[PDB]
Every structure is written in structure tokens, then in C-alpha cells.
Amino acid sequence: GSCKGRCFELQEVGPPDCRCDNLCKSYSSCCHDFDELCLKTARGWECTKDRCGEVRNEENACHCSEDCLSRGDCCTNYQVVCKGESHWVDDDCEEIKVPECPAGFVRPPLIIFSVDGFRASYMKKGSKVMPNIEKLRSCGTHAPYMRPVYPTKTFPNLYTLATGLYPESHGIVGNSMYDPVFDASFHLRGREKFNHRWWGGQPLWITATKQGVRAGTFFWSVSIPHERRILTILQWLSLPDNERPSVYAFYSEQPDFSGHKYGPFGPEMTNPLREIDKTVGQLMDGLKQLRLHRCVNVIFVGDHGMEDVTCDRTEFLSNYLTNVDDITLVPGTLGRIRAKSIYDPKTIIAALTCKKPDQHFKPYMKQHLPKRLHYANNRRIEDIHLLVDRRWHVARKPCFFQGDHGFDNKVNSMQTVFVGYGPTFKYRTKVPPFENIELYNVMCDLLGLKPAPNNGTHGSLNHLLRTNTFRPTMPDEVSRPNYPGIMYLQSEFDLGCTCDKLEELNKRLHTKGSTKERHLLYGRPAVLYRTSYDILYHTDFESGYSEIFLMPLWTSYTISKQAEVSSIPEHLTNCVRPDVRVSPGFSQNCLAYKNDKQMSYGFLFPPYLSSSPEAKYDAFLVTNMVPMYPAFKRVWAYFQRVLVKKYASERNGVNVISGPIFDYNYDGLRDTEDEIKQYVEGSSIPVPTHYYSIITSCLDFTQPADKCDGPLSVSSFILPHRPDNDESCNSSEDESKWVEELMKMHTARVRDIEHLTGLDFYRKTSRSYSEILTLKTYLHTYE
Numbered sequence: 001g002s003c004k005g006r007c008f009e010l011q012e013v014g015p016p017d018c019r020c021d022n023l024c025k026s027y028s029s030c031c032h033d034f035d036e037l038c039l040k041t042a043r044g045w046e047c048t049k050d051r052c053g054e055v056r057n058e059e060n061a062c063h064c065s066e067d068c069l070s071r072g073d074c075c076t077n078y079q080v081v082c083k084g085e086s087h088w089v090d091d092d093c094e095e096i097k098v099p100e101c102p103a104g105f106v107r108p109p110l111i112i113f114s115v116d117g118f119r120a121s122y123m124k125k126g127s128k129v130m131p132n133i134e135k136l137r138s139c140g141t142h143a144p145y146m147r148p149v150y151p152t153k154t155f156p157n158l159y160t161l162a163t164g165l166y167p168e169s170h171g172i173v174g175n176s177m178y179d180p181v182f183d184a185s186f187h188l189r190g191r192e193k194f195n196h197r198w199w200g201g202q203p204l205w206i207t208a209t210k211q212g213v214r215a216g217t218f219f220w221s222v223s224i225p226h227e228r229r230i231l232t233i234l235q236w237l238s239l240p241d242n243e244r245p246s247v248y249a250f251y252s253e254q255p256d257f258s259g260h261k262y263g264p265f266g267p268e269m270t271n272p273l274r275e276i277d278k279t280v281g282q283l284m285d286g287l288k289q290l291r292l293h294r295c296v297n298v299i300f301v302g303d304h305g306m307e308d309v310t311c312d313r314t315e316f317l318s319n320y321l322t323n324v325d326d327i328t329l330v331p332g333t334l335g336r337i338r339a340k341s342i343y344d345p346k347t348i349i350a351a352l353t354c355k356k357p358d359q360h361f362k363p364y365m366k367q368h369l370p371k372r373l374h375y376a377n378n379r380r381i382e383d384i385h386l387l388v389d390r391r392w393h394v395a396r397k398p399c400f401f402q403g404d405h406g407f408d409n410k411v412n413s414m415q416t417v418f419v420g421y422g423p424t425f426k427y428r429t430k431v432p433p434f435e436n437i438e439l440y441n442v443m444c445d446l447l448g449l450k451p452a453p454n455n456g457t458h459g460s461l462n463h464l465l466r467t468n469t470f471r472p473t474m475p476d477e478v479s480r481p482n483y484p485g486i487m488y489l490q491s492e493f494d495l496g497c498t499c500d501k502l503e504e505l506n507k508r509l510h511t512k513g514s515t516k517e518r519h520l521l522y523g524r525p526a527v528l529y530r531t532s533y534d535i536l537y538h539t540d541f542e543s544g545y546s547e548i549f550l551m552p553l554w555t556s557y558t559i560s561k562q563a564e565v566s567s568i569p570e571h572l573t574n575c576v577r578p579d580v581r582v583s584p585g586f587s588q589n590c591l592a593y594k595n596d597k598q599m600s601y602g603f604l605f606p607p608y609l610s611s612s613p614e615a616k617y618d619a620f621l622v623t624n625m626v627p628m629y630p631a632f633k634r635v636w637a638y639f640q641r642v643l644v645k646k647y648a649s650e651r652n653g654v655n656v657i658s659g660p661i662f663d664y665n666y667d668g669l670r671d672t673e674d675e676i677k678q679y680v681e682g683s684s685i686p687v688p689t690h691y692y693s694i695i696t697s698c699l700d701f702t703q704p705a706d707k708c709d710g711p712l713s714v715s716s717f718i719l720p721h722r723p724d725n726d727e728s729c730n731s732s733e734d735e736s737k738w739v740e741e742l743m744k745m746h747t748a749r750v751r752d753i754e755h756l757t758g759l760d761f762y763r764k765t766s767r768s769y770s771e772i773l774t775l776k777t778y779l780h781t782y783e
Ligand SMILES: *[C@@H]1O[C@H](CO)[C@@H](O[C@@H]2O[C@H](CO)[C@@H](O[C@@H]3O[C@H](CO)[C@@H](O)[C@H](O)[C@@H]3O)[C@H](O)[C@H]2NC(C)=O)[C@H](O)[C@H]1NC(C)=O
Pocket: 165, 166, 169, 201, 374, 453, 454, 455, 667, 668, 669, 755
């Protein structure tokens, strides 16, 4: 019943026996002498010359005795003060070409140093405030910033780090949440969070244990001082070979706590950052004492940033809703709304939509949230969501705090940090910003583990690593296209469409020709599911036409910097032409659109960008038509007539691939036919939930998009196909005052589109597949 000989033991005792491990305090289950024997404070955390060679006194917090390495309970500066060695931070960086590990070590250990609320810009504070951190950052591998997951709160992000999964998939969708199947709520405070029922996926410590690799206890009771957490890691690293973990985690509550109290750019922030640096320095000195400083891979990572947020920037729901007693709100930097008793969700949303000119939040049904957030597919996510403006809070009803976080994960102030240091990371290497869902694959690689299935894209971070355990391979195409000829005659169609000579004298009409070379610059997308579709070629564009969904899965075209924009002449406004290459039965019909009072149609390739009046007639083929709400046509037509040409002008030409997305179950994945819940009336033409475009050009803008030697540059979006423009509060103005702002909100990665369509892009380029995976994970943020 005593913690003697057992402090911070790895085996977990009881219930009910008294525990002496990392978490015993959190359960209020430690042995009576835990706080006495294990949380020793006497004489602080640094050796002084007068202690060198002292007799071991057990009440000392750390030791300067000659027996202190045999336990690894020496103070971390022991050798510096007593044996003439130097501080890790004062040593020159020297490349670590191979792991330099001592006797007994069969792989490089991994230590994860997680710092709560460490904003990316704090790194700009430099080596006068954070000398140890700046050394890790400059000698190792680092990104200018790492993007967290939404919501940008600690539990969702630390668990995403651990699992490689979006919160919707791992289950930790908030710091607070209610589960209607358990009928219970989870909170930062209390016991409920300790119940395994809440935690899904497979976190790294479980992946490791399952594959025979020992993991240290990642979690730390808040009562354990940071210095004792470092000393405990060093103690574990000193254990025999058959008991020593290979992976460890340190967690610090700072700089988050001071960020909340003083704001991100308060002068008070410098002290907490100095203290974090000290802790890193203690870890590095400690490793160096154990001859592990050129053997361990260290990951210094944050979970989210911090924004300026004060009391008097609070919107209150009682100022919008007359029935605020009927609802339960999860409040703050995001809002989630539920009924108090299992109120009407459609009236709640309408009552919160564009009611005040400076309104600092926007309501969404969860399925209408931007797809890049991946924040819908979980019963813990309430149907009603408030996306709150940066710098603001939302509360239910009507200063000690100056900072908060939780906002949209593309907001600048929410970005966090990443540095990788050690033999397996690259040397003095800067890498592009990347998302925190990508690290679990890399941590697995670093430990020799096979990752469990996750939302990372394995290989998209190979460029962080000196030597890679994993080489990606491009997936095999599942469906092979048909390339149908001009088989059928005009008179065989009656699709109910109308139109209003030279195409009879063109024998080579709709043949491959030079269409593939100029309009598919990166190869045909591959179709990764079973379906039947047709490649269709035209002077100005190429498309993959689905005989099942009666529309293209994709439409590809290139527009040069010098492309002319033209009008749809009035004699062609209502023109729709039957496609002589596709059968009537696998074609859309115009009558269904005339029968459907809510629904109109648009075109994937824009008639506005035709290369000639002759070629413009191709844009009106029934195989280029897609169902579109009139409200959405305002957005689409502006995109196609104005913004594509702008992008072409700014980027030295662009290649565009556009198409429909069906995601009626909001799982982020391509719907099967059975899952499509809306069709054009009286018809079998499915209604898309979204429309995507992927806009590619040369990263070197001095080369045109069709003559690009090197790295590519991409921006993409996934626009919600909505029958109104209630999302955009300025929509009653000219499209130039609101459409582009809409599209920027709905920016997306190419990977997001691949999941939602079952397509694989960029299969024929001069780049390596690893480089391509990096491109596919890129998000253009507009921040
Ligand atoms: C993010 O990653 C997770 C994990 O890879 C993805 O969740 C997984 O989704 C698949 C497909 O829906 C689920 O697998 C299915 O299992 C059953 C048979 O047991 C069968 O009905 C299907 O044919 C398929 O095998 C799986 O449950 C699920 N795994 C987890 C942990 O949730 C998720 O789709 C990813 N999200 C995105 C947007 O890519």
C-alpha cells in the first residue's frame, strides 16, 4: 500500500489497489504517500556546485549523487554543473546522418513534446526568448505552420494527432459533447471522459502495443510539475531493455493558459514562452546526459493557436431567438444547438440568418458547413452549428479573459507549430504547411509500425524524412472508359430540347486530335469504383460522361492568359443539343427540367470561353448539362464568365477540372445510387449536393500552364448546391460583392474531392508520386 520503489511505475495496479502511476491523481486513487514520495520538491530542479557528489538524500526532488544515472533521476543540468559538460543549446548543430544510439537500443525512440495553444507566430519571437526551441527549429525539419482540425480546441486536436482521424471519425468532436445513444455528456472536468466508450479509432499508443512496441503513459495528471514529467521520461528511458518504452509524450498546459488570460500578443506571453523553452532545454540536456541526443526523434507540436477575444465581443442568442429557454447551446468560439427536451430547427436557423448588419456568426445545418471542415458525420455533432467570427464569442443569454480559440481551422490565429528533430528527420530543412491529420502515419513510420486506417495521405509527408519506410503507389483504375464514336443520327432523339451545316462537312468532328494534349494536361482522372462511362472529346474541352448519373463525372479544359470572354448570344440562350455519341436512354431530357419548377440547368464547360463561334455549339451538348438551382446559377455563371478568366490572367493560364458531387449522407464520401435522395422531378437525373473545380497552373508563373517544367500550383473548391443564397448575406448585391467570398469559404484540397467523387487526379505528370500526394493535400486558404 506504499509508493516506495514504485513512483511513476508503468504497470497499472488495481482497482482497487492504490496506484502510483501518471494518472492516479486524476482518479483520486494514489497511495497515501504518493504526494510525499513521488512529488518531491526539495531544493528545486537544478544542481548547484555544492551538491556535486552529495550523499543521496531521498527527499531531494532530483539528485546530484554518483548513483543518479543508474536511475536516471539526476537533475538535468548535473553533468554541466558537476562534470564540465556543455548545455545542448550551446553546442553547434551537427547533422545526424544515422541514429547514434547506445547499448540496448533496438530502434530510435520517439518523444512527442506537445504544447497547448502554441501559435505559429510565437516562433517569430526568436532565440533571445526561446533559444532551445529555435535550435530544434533551425537544425531540424520545420513547417512555417501546421493546420489543426476543427473545432480548434484541445481534446479534438490532441486525439486527431494520436489517431490520424478527423474528429467526426474518432468521436472527440468537442471539449464538451452530448451523445444521444449514451444519453450522457462529456466534459473537460469530471470523470465521464475517462470512460473508454467515448474514444474511437486507434491511437498511437495502442497501435504500438498491438505490434509489440512498448508505449509510455502519454497522459499526465495536471498536478505533476513539468519538471517531474521530464524527469520521469528520462527515468523510463533508463529502464532495462525489456521494460523501456519506445514512444513517449510530454504535454504542457502552456502557453494556452496565459494566452487565455492575456491574449496572444500580450507582453505577459514572453515569460510563459521562456518557461516552455527552459523545459525543452531540460529535456535536451537530459537526453545528452544519457547519450540519446543524437538517437531520439523529437516532435515539437502544438494543438491550436490563440486569438484576441474579450467579454464585450459576445453575441447573445437571446437577442435573436424569442424562445431561448427551449434550446441548449454549447457556447463560445463555436456554437452547437440542440433542444433542451427531446423548438423547430428550420425556424431556429431562419431566425439566426442575416438579422443584423454586423452579425458576428453564421448558422448552418451541419451538412452545409464547408466540406474541408469534415464536421458532420457523427451523432455527437448537433444538426445546428454556428460558425463564429474570429475575435468573437456566442453565448445563450446575458474582463478576466483576453484570449480564446476554437474558430475555423483556416483562420491565421488558429495555426500552430511543428518541428521534427533527430536522426530520421531531415537536417536544416523547411517544408510547406501541412495538416495535423498527417502526423500519425509519420509517427508510425518513425516507430516501424503499420498505421491503422486513417485520414492522412500516406506518403504526402515523405519529404520530412531522411529515410522512408513507405513508398506510395498510385491506385489501379477500376473502371475503364468507353470511347464512343459518332454512332447515332439526329432524328433518333426526342429529348424535348431545341436549338436553332458545317458539322456535316467535318468528318474528324469529336475525334481525339489535339484535345488530350491541350485540355488534359495531367492525364485522364482514373475512376476508382465500378461504373460505366464515356470519354468525350471536343475542340475546347474533354469530359468523362457517366451513363449512370447522366452527366459528366469530370470536365477538363485549359484557358490561356490571352483567352477572350464572349456572351451566350440571345439566339442560343435556351439551346440544348443532342449528343450523337451517346444513346437517348443514357441522356438527360429537357422536358424534366420544364416539369421541375424549382430546378434549372447549367454547363460544366462554359459557353463563355469557347474558342470560336463554331466551337461554342459544343458547349450546348446535352452531355455538358448539369442540374442547377436558379440561386446557384448566379454563383456558377459568375465563376464561369468572370472568375475563370481572372484566374487565367493572374496565373499565366489555368487548367480547370469541374464536376458534380453527391454526398447526401454527409460522410465525405461518394454516394452510391441507393444513397441519392433527390432527382430532377419525374426523372432519373440525380441532383448534386455540390459542384467542384480544381484549378491548376505552373508554380513558376513565368511559364504558361500548358508548358510547365516543374512543380504545379493548385486551388480547388467544393461549392454547396443550394436553392438559395442565404449563406451569403450580401447576395442581393451584384455578384462581384459576394460570390468570390463564398467560394473562398468553400476552398478544398484535391484529396477532399477524390474522396467525394471516387476519382484519382494527376496520374500523368513529370513529378514524383510523393510530390503529387503533397499537392493533393494542399489547401489554398486566402489568409
Ligand atoms: C477517415 O478515415 C476513416 C478510417 O479509414 C474512414 O472511416 C471508415 O470508413 C469506412 C468506409 O465507410 C468504414 O468501413 C466500412 O466497413 C464496413 C464493414 O465493416 C462496410 O460497410 C464497408 O464496405 C467498409 O469496409 C469504416 O467503418 C470507417 N472506419 C472508421 C474508424 O471510422 C473515413 O471514411 C475517413 N473519412 C474521409 C472523409 O475520408
